[PDB]
């Protein structure tokens, strides 16, 4: 009952308990939403010419035989997502060897996929998509040290309480484009961590474009932490969003607004854009992000900032875009962005400003000195007029009769 149109076969929500028959010249087959209950050699014996492979969401306990994929040596891309409870037998991707993405969120799999020999005939192998599973600890295999290519490794949502030096040695000299850790967890990773001089560098010798560290709380203790343990990793792009521990409370003493040393493992990093929305910072600190000193892009967007200290951007002066919209800030003290030469745009809106006089003065005249950097409009508490539109009236000795 498939639409077999060209080079495509769309099989998809067909109630078929098997791989129906298919003409031999396809290279497009989509099977998801089907009973198929398990795969073999025989499932594609006669579509030997396919490069892209779907198989998501089948019944429950898909079973993939060895040698399913024997001799598809110009399949690129499978995607096998969505299969509760998957089982592999361990020589179930065989003769893959030009696959270069491959895809199994939700199949409640474990360390042991990534452990054992399941991938190791994926020399191909760019990009992993590994999300929502059950891999409590990141362990690869020797062979990952031959996969030349391999820089997408995506494991959101799974619980994985740390990441360490040697579970990570087999990425050793790897560059990931995409290491995307976010929401899992980190768990084990804090202040009272016992296992920090054992855990050492996860990243040692390893190289990243952007590292995805969102929803992982990341109180400041633990950024530190993490940060000097890490030290000297280079990364181009961090993002931290919805660190949902990060930022102080006068409800729980222990927890700290980050501070001028709480990124200084970063100090080394490259780190080109910093992403820290989202968060729960009150209070922009003396030098906390005087390490970045590459920084061309940083946001500070929707966190619940009401104080920005004389020098919180000490040793930016290379960065282009700031965003500070969307926190609780009334004021900012006279000159704080005076030394951000480079900047190009400015957030400042969806703040609660006072555009009382004097104190709106520095504000308001800045704003329209550089009004064409400004993205979006701050706009005055009470009134709702622009900030850029504030003229204060000057002090009355200043201009004498
Ligand atoms: C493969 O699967 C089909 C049914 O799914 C079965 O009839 C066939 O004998 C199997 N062949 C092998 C080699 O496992
Ligand atoms: C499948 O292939 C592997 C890896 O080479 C082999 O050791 C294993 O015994 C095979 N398993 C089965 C169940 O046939
Ligand atoms: C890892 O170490 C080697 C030296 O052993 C170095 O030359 C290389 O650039 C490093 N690789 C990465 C990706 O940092």
């Known amino acids: 009952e498939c639409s077999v149109i060209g080079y495509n076969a769309i099989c998809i929500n067909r109630g078929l ?108 192998l760019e990009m992993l998509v590994l999300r929502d599973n059950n891999i409590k600890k990141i362990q690869p295999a020797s062979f990952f040290l031959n996969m030349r290519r391999f820089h997408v490794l995506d494991l959101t949502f799974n619980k994985v309480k740390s990441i360490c030096e040697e579970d990570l040695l087999n990425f050793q000299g790897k560059h990931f484009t995409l290491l995307r850790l976010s929401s899992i967890t980190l768990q084990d990773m804090n202040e009272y961590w016992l296992g920090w001089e054992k855990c050492g560098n996860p990243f040692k010798n390893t190289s990243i474009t952007t590292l995805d560290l969102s929803g992982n709380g990341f109180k400041e203790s633990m950024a530190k932490r993490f940060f000097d343990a890490i030290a000297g990793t280079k990364i181009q792009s961090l993002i931290l969003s919805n660190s949902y521990n990060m930022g102080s409370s006068f409800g729980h003493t222990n ?12 100090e080394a990093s490259g780190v080109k854009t910093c992403d820290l929305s989202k968060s729960k910072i009150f209070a922009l600190l003396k030098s906390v992000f005087s390490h970045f000193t590459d920084l061309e892009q940083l946001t500070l967007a929707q966190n619940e ?97």
């Open 255 to 266: 927890f700290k607004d980050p501070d001028n040393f709480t990124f200084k493992g970063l």
């Open 17 to 124: 308990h098997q791989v129906p028959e298919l003409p031999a010249h396809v290279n497009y087959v989509d099977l998801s939403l089907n009973s198929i209950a398990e795969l073999n050699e025989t499932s594609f014996s006669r579509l030997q010419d396919l490069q892209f492979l779907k198989v998501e969401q089948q019944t429950p306990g898909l079973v993939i035989r060895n040698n399913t994929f024997r001799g598809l040596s110009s399949l690129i891309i499978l995607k096998l997502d969505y299969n509760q409870f998957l089982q592999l037998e361990t020589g179930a991707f065989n003769g893959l060897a030009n696959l270069e993405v491959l895809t199994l969120t939700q199949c409640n799999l474990d360390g042991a996929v990534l452990s054992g020999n399941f991938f190791k005939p994926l020399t191909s």
């Open 305 to 401: 900032i009401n104080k920005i200290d004389d020098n919180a951007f000490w040793g930016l002066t290379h960065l282009k875009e700031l965003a500070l919209d969307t926190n609780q800030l009334k004021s900012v003290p006279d000159g704080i962005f005076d030394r951000l030469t480079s900047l190009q745009k400015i957030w400042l809106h969806t703040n609660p400003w006072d555009c009382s006089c004097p104190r709106i003065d520095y504000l308001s005249r800045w704003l329209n000195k550089n009004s064409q950097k400004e993205q979006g409009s701050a706009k005055c508490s009470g009134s709702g007029k622009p900030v850029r539109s504030i003229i204060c009236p000057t002090s009355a000795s200043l201009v004498p009769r």
